[PDB]
Structures are given as C-alpha cells and as structure tokens.
Design a protein around this ligand. Structure first.
Ligand code: HEC
Ligand code: HEC
Ligand code: HEC
Ligand code: HEC
Lengths: 181, 181
C-alpha cells in the first residue's frame, strides 16, 4: 500500500506558466552555475511567465525583493501577493541579476506545489543518489495512472474500402486497418 | 526563433497537488472511459489533493457543483473560490460519481495552468496525431533547458586513497575516480 513518511518535501511549484525547482548542488554542477547561488531553477516557462521575459534556465532569486531560496518560501511570497495583478521578479541569468515584471489581468494567484511522483518499492532511481527515497517520494501503487497513458497503443480503426488516406504512406491498408467493404 | 500562433491552448492545471488535463477522445479511448464523459483527467495527485481521496485516473466533473469541462473553466472556478480553505469535488471513478472535500489550512488558491512544452521545428511527435503542432506548441529553442539536465552526466569526484565507499561495489575505484594519494 501507500507509505508516506512524516516529511515528503516539495519538488516543484507552478506559477503563472513558470515551473520552479529547488536549485540543488547537483543542478548547480549540471548547469555550471555558481555553487553558492541561492534561489529556484526555472526549468520551464510559458504564458505570462514567458511574456515577462523569464526563460528556462533562469534562477529565481526574489519576488518583490523578498529572497526566495526554497519552494516553501516562494509559495509564501506568492500567497502574500496572490491577489495582485503584477509582481517583480529578480532573476540570475548568465551572471547578471535582472528584474522582470510578471503580470496577469485578473490576479497572479498562489503558486501551486507538488512532490516528486509516487514510486513502486522496486522502481529504479533515474537520477544520481540524493538520500533515502522516502525523504522525497511516497511509496505505493496509486500516485499516478499506470499503465502510463503515454504508452498505451490505440488500434487504427476499421476503414471503408477506398477511404482517403489522411496520413503519409505506411503500407497496405489491411496491414493495419480492418477494411469495411 | 520563438513562434507562438494566436491560440496556444492550455495542457495542464496544477491545483493543491492535483494535475488536471483535458479529457480528450484519445485519452477516453486509452483509458476505456465512457466516450461522452466530460471533465478533466487527474493524472497525478499528492499533498492536499491526495488527502481528499482524489486519485490518479479520476475524472474531475465539478468543483462546488459547477461543472468543469475545460481547463479554462476549471481555472475560473478555482479563481472564484481561491480564498476559501475548502471546496467540493465531484469525481467520476469506475462508474460512480463521488464527492470529495479538498482543503488547505491557509487558502486553496488559483489553479496554475501551462501549455504543452515548446518544440523544435524538427521534433518528433511522441503522441498520436492531434492536429497542426502550432495549435498546442510554441516553436523555438528556449521554452525549457537543453541539454535536458536529466541527461547531463556528472563526473564522480577525485577521492582520497582509502576513502570509505558509500555506494555498492562498482569496480576498481580508479576506473571512475581520480585517486588523491
Ligand atoms: C492504405 C493507403 C491506408 C488507408 C487508406 C489508411 N491507412 Fe491508416 N492509420 C494508422 C494509424 C496509427 C492511424 C491513427 C491516426 C494517426 O495518429 O496517424 C491511422 C488512421 C487512418 C484513418 C483515420 C482514422 C479515423 O477514423 O479517423 C484513415 C481514413 C486511414 N488511416 C486510412 C496506421 C496505418 C498503418 C500502420 C503501419 C497502415 C499501413 C495504414 N494506416 C494504411 C492506411
Ligand atoms: C572503489 C571501491 C571505489 C571507492 C572507494 C569509491 N568509488 Fe565511487 N562514485 C561513483 C559515482 C557515479 C558516484 C556519485 C554518487 C552516486 O550517485 O552514486 C560515486 C561517489 C563516490 C564517493 C562520494 C563522492 C563525494 O564526494 O561525495 C566516494 C567516497 C566514492 N565514490 C568512492 C562511481 C564509481 C564507479 C563507476 C563504475 C566506480 C568503479 C567507483 N565509483 C568505485 C569507488
Ligand atoms: C529528493 C531529494 C529525492 C530523493 C532522496 C530521491 N528522489 Fe527520486 N526523484 C526526485 C525528483 C525531484 C524526481 C523528478 C525528476 C527529477 O530528477 O527532477 C525524481 C524522480 C524519480 C523517479 C521517476 C518517477 C516518475 O517519473 O514517475 C523514480 C523511479 C525515482 N525518483 C526513484 C528514487 C529512488 C529509488 C530513490 C532512493 C534510493 C529516490 N528516487 C530518491 C527526488 C528524489
Ligand atoms: C494538442 C491538441 C497537441 C497538438 C496538436 C500537438 N501536440 Fe505535441 N504534445 C501535446 C501535449 C499535451 C504533450 C505533452 C505530453 C502528452 O502527450 O500529454 C505533447 C508533447 C509533445 C512533445 C514532447 C515535448 C516535451 O516533452 O518536451 C513533442 C516533441 C511534441 N508534442 C511534438 C508535436 C508535433 C511535431 C506535433 C504536430 C505534427 C504536435 N506535437 C501536435 C499536445 C499537442
């Protein structure tokens, strides 16, 4: 069944199109970032975060001049300003600290946080060692859909003999489709 | 450079530990769900969403009895109730509609939404055809960190001759580590 130690930590925060992660030593080493830089790695931007000029690989240092060194502290600052439409971001990028403005026409809202996915007891760690697995992962069967939908293969349909072919050439139609004739 | 058509749609919403996706025909077929079920597939739960009883594979049908058939409409309802501490969820699971209660001690907050990742022009679609790529993806180089950090290999360090071995046996130390001697 589903085991969750007292203390499963946050792994990501989602805020206005940005995905923010703790900036570990492992990431600092992987990304050739100063080893004493403190902040949150932005590994993805889209939507209002993309519009602000925020980029994947930026390190988020402060929101409204309040330092954010942990996802908890990021969430706290977003909660403070959640009903505002605009917030300042200080971002470390290739050596310079930039200020960027983040805005949404209704309200910025609370950053929504998540833990690392639930794992099976016999799951293979896809990353370097980071400590005891239950520090970061629930252990169980249910935390996400399996078989992963991403690997479920759908049958091509039946087709009527002489149907126009909507995809590129793939071979004789009957290799893949029941022919309704 | 970075091309974004007028109309890049939402792909996911993050709310209190749940990840919600539009429930497409493709997913309905993959998951053997009724083809006329309307709602949002929950593909991941953790944190307060896990505590409510919400499970990966659940379909979110309503929040506070307001139907949510699209991520926009989900976000709208969460915005309505963002300062509340509790909200009702109606969930389709294996044929039954359940009501679940979602709570956070401070406030539930706005669901934070994202688009599908930015792609290169020559990227290979990892999914079935779903229409023109620019309906769902920005096209460019920057939307996320590449080389993907997940595939960057870190060198094992130098080690002092006779250091205790913290990992299992992997072979002669010098195969992998500079020996400080
Ligand atoms: C011989 C020339 C044909 C014809 C006339 C068609 N097919 Fe295929 N088909 C395949 C797959 C995986 C799909 C799913 C769509 C996708 O993501 O590519 C399809 C789809 C079709 C359709 C549309 C189905 C629908 O109801 O919308 C039609 C009309 C169609 N095909 C006709 C796979 C294959 C193959 C596997 C190697 C082969 C061979 C073919 N198709 C061949 C043809
Ligand atoms: C011969 C018995 C040895 C000894 C004494 C050690 N190693 Fe390794 N090592 C390897 C990798 C990929 C790591 C990173 C940690 C991880 O995620 O597994 C390590 C780490 C170490 C350390 C700690 C490094 C640090 O500064 O914290 C130490 C003390 C250490 N090793 C000693 C990889 C390899 C190998 C690749 C096949 C081989 C062989 C070894 N290690 C062998 C040994
Ligand atoms: C945090 C300090 C972690 C510890 C300790 C462990 N894992 Fe982990 N894991 C972590 C994160 C943040 C992620 C997401 C991807 C990333 O590296 O950023 C992962 C991922 C996994 C996965 C894949 C899960 C999935 O995609 O569904 C597995 C199977 C996994 N981790 C296993 C694992 C094991 C066996 C561990 C201990 C021996 C372990 N992890 C430790 C964060 C952390
Ligand atoms: C929405 C209706 C989509 C259309 C049309 C296309 N893609 Fe897509 N893509 C979409 C989603 C929601 C996702 C995430 C995973 C999932 O299937 O749920 C994807 C993923 C990709 C990826 C991987 C991106 C990454 O992990 O960084 C690629 C490379 C990708 N899609 C390519 C692609 C191409 C070439 C398309 C048109 C011919 C295309 N996609 C259409 C949603 C949508």
């Amino acid at each position: 069944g589903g085991f969750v130690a007292p203390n499963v930590q946050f792994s990501e925060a989602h805020w206005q199109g940005m995905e923010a992660l703790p900036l570990s030593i492992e990431l600092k080493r992987k990304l050739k970032l100063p080893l004493d830089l403190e902040g949150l790695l932005i590994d993805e931007t889209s939507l209002n975060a993309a519009v602000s000029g925020l980029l994947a690989g930026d390190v988020l240092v402060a929101i409204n001049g309040r330092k954010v060194k942990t996802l908890k502290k990021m969430q706290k600052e977003t909660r403070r300003v959640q009903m505002d439409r605009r917030a300042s971001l200080t971002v470390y990028r290739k050596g310079r600290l930039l200020t960027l403005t983040l805005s949404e026409e209704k309200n910025l809202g609370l950053a929504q946080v998540e833990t690392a996915p639930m794992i099976l007891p016999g799951d293979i760690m896809p990353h370097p060692y980071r400590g005891p697995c239950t520090q970061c992962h629930a252990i169980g069967t249910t935390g996400h859909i399996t078989p992963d939908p991403d690997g479920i293969v759908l049958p091509p349909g039946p087709i009527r003999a002489g149907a126009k072919m909507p995809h590129r050439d793939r071979g004789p139609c009957a290799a893949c489709h029941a022919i309704i004739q």
